[PDB]
Design a protein around this motif. Structure first.
Motif, mmCIF file in Angstrom:
data_model
loop_
_atom_site.group_PDB
_atom_site.id
_atom_site.type_symbol
_atom_site.label_atom_id
_atom_site.label_comp_id
_atom_site.label_asym_id
_atom_site.label_seq_id
_atom_site.Cartn_x
_atom_site.Cartn_y
_atom_site.Cartn_z
ATOM 1 N N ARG A 35 0.823 -1.211 0.000
ATOM 2 C CA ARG A 35 0.000 0.000 0.000
ATOM 3 C C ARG A 35 0.856 1.260 0.000
ATOM 4 O O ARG A 35 0.560 2.204 -0.734
ATOM 5 C CB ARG A 35 -0.993 0.031 1.174
ATOM 6 C CG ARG A 35 -2.127 -0.951 0.891
ATOM 7 C CD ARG A 35 -3.300 -0.871 1.864
ATOM 8 N NE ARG A 35 -4.319 -1.841 1.446
ATOM 9 C CZ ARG A 35 -5.336 -2.281 2.192
ATOM 10 N NH1 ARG A 35 -5.603 -1.746 3.386
ATOM 11 N NH2 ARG A 35 -6.083 -3.281 1.721
ATOM 12 N N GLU A 74 -1.304 -6.911 -6.325
ATOM 13 C CA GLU A 74 -2.490 -6.160 -6.714
ATOM 14 C C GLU A 74 -3.652 -6.313 -5.721
ATOM 15 O O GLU A 74 -4.315 -5.328 -5.402
ATOM 16 C CB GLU A 74 -2.929 -6.594 -8.118
ATOM 17 C CG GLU A 74 -1.868 -6.282 -9.182
ATOM 18 C CD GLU A 74 -2.347 -6.700 -10.568
ATOM 19 O OE1 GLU A 74 -2.263 -7.915 -10.849
ATOM 20 O OE2 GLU A 74 -2.797 -5.803 -11.311
ATOM 21 N N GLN A 77 -4.555 -3.871 -2.923
ATOM 22 C CA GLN A 77 -5.317 -2.677 -3.230
ATOM 23 C C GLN A 77 -6.830 -2.877 -3.090
ATOM 24 O O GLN A 77 -7.574 -1.969 -3.454
ATOM 25 C CB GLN A 77 -4.924 -2.158 -4.624
ATOM 26 C CG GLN A 77 -3.415 -1.892 -4.748
ATOM 27 C CD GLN A 77 -2.935 -0.826 -3.767
ATOM 28 O OE1 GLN A 77 -2.314 -1.134 -2.756
ATOM 29 N NE2 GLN A 77 -3.233 0.440 -4.044
ATOM 30 N N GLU A 78 -7.310 -4.011 -2.557
ATOM 31 C CA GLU A 78 -8.734 -4.271 -2.371
ATOM 32 C C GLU A 78 -9.418 -3.087 -1.676
ATOM 33 O O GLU A 78 -10.288 -2.433 -2.249
ATOM 34 C CB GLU A 78 -8.901 -5.583 -1.589
ATOM 35 C CG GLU A 78 -10.368 -5.946 -1.331
ATOM 36 C CD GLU A 78 -10.473 -7.251 -0.549
ATOM 37 O OE1 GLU A 78 -10.164 -7.208 0.660
ATOM 38 O OE2 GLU A 78 -10.845 -8.267 -1.177
ATOM 39 N N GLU A 79 -9.013 -2.784 -0.441
ATOM 40 C CA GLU A 79 -9.604 -1.686 0.312
ATOM 41 C C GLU A 79 -9.310 -0.326 -0.332
ATOM 42 O O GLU A 79 -10.030 0.638 -0.083
ATOM 43 C CB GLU A 79 -9.129 -1.721 1.768
ATOM 44 C CG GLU A 79 -9.498 -3.040 2.465
ATOM 45 C CD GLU A 79 -8.938 -3.091 3.882
ATOM 46 O OE1 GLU A 79 -7.753 -3.474 4.003
ATOM 47 O OE2 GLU A 79 -9.688 -2.729 4.812
ATOM 48 N N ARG A 80 -8.276 -0.242 -1.176
ATOM 49 C CA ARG A 80 -7.942 0.988 -1.878
ATOM 50 C C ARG A 80 -8.953 1.259 -3.002
ATOM 51 O O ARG A 80 -8.978 2.374 -3.522
ATOM 52 C CB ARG A 80 -6.496 0.952 -2.402
ATOM 53 C CG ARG A 80 -5.450 0.799 -1.283
ATOM 54 C CD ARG A 80 -5.075 2.143 -0.646
ATOM 55 N NE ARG A 80 -4.355 3.021 -1.586
ATOM 56 C CZ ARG A 80 -3.024 3.059 -1.765
ATOM 57 N NH1 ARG A 80 -2.225 2.169 -1.172
ATOM 58 N NH2 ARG A 80 -2.491 3.997 -2.553
ATOM 59 N N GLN A 81 -9.808 0.289 -3.371
ATOM 60 C CA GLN A 81 -10.836 0.495 -4.390
ATOM 61 C C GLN A 81 -11.992 1.324 -3.813
ATOM 62 O O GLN A 81 -13.130 0.862 -3.732
ATOM 63 C CB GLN A 81 -11.346 -0.846 -4.948
ATOM 64 C CG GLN A 81 -10.255 -1.770 -5.501
ATOM 65 C CD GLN A 81 -9.285 -1.045 -6.427
ATOM 66 O OE1 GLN A 81 -9.622 -0.718 -7.559
ATOM 67 N NE2 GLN A 81 -8.072 -0.783 -5.953
ATOM 68 N N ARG A 82 -11.710 2.567 -3.419
ATOM 69 C CA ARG A 82 -12.676 3.493 -2.849
ATOM 70 C C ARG A 82 -13.618 4.038 -3.932
ATOM 71 O O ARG A 82 -13.624 5.232 -4.235
ATOM 72 C CB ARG A 82 -11.932 4.597 -2.082
ATOM 73 C CG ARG A 82 -10.938 5.374 -2.963
ATOM 74 C CD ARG A 82 -11.198 6.883 -2.889
ATOM 75 N NE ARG A 82 -10.493 7.598 -3.960
ATOM 76 C CZ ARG A 82 -10.907 7.656 -5.236
ATOM 77 N NH1 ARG A 82 -12.012 7.009 -5.630
ATOM 78 N NH2 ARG A 82 -10.202 8.370 -6.120
ATOM 79 N N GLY A 83 -14.421 3.157 -4.533
ATOM 80 C CA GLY A 83 -15.367 3.513 -5.579
ATOM 81 C C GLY A 83 -16.304 4.626 -5.115
ATOM 82 O O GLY A 83 -17.438 4.363 -4.720
#
Ligand SMILES: [Zn+2]
Ligand SMILES: [Zn+2]
Length: 83
Positions: A35, A74, A77-83
């Motif tokens: 991260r 990659e 980055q799950e939680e980084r996917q702040r859609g």
């Protein structure tokens, strides 16, 4: 492995972190490292003797090992996917 030892340090795995049998220390450590997108060093050569003895203090080498097996970076980055 069959007996889910941590692919990196041989600890008891909690789950297949980033697709590879891994332990709590490694779970968080790898996540943090990726991260942040960090790099480290160890008071050994790159071929550091990674075993149970090498606690998460041995960040660099644990990271190298994780990369060597090919932990799915990659996925961190799950939680980084702040859609
Ligand atoms: Zn581990
Ligand atoms: Zn080391």
């Amino acid at each position: 492995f069959t007996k889910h030892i941590c692919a990196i340090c041989g600890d008891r795995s909690s789950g297949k972190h980033y697709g590879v049998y891994s332990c709590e220390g490694c779970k968080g450590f790898f996540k943090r490292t990726v991260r942040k997108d960090l790099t480290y060093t160890c008071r050994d050569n790159k071929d550091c003797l990674i075993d149970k003895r090498q606690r998460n203090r041995c960040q660099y080498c644990r990271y190298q090992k994780a990369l060597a097996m090919g932990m799915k970076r990659e996925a961190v980055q799950e939680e980084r996917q702040r859609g």
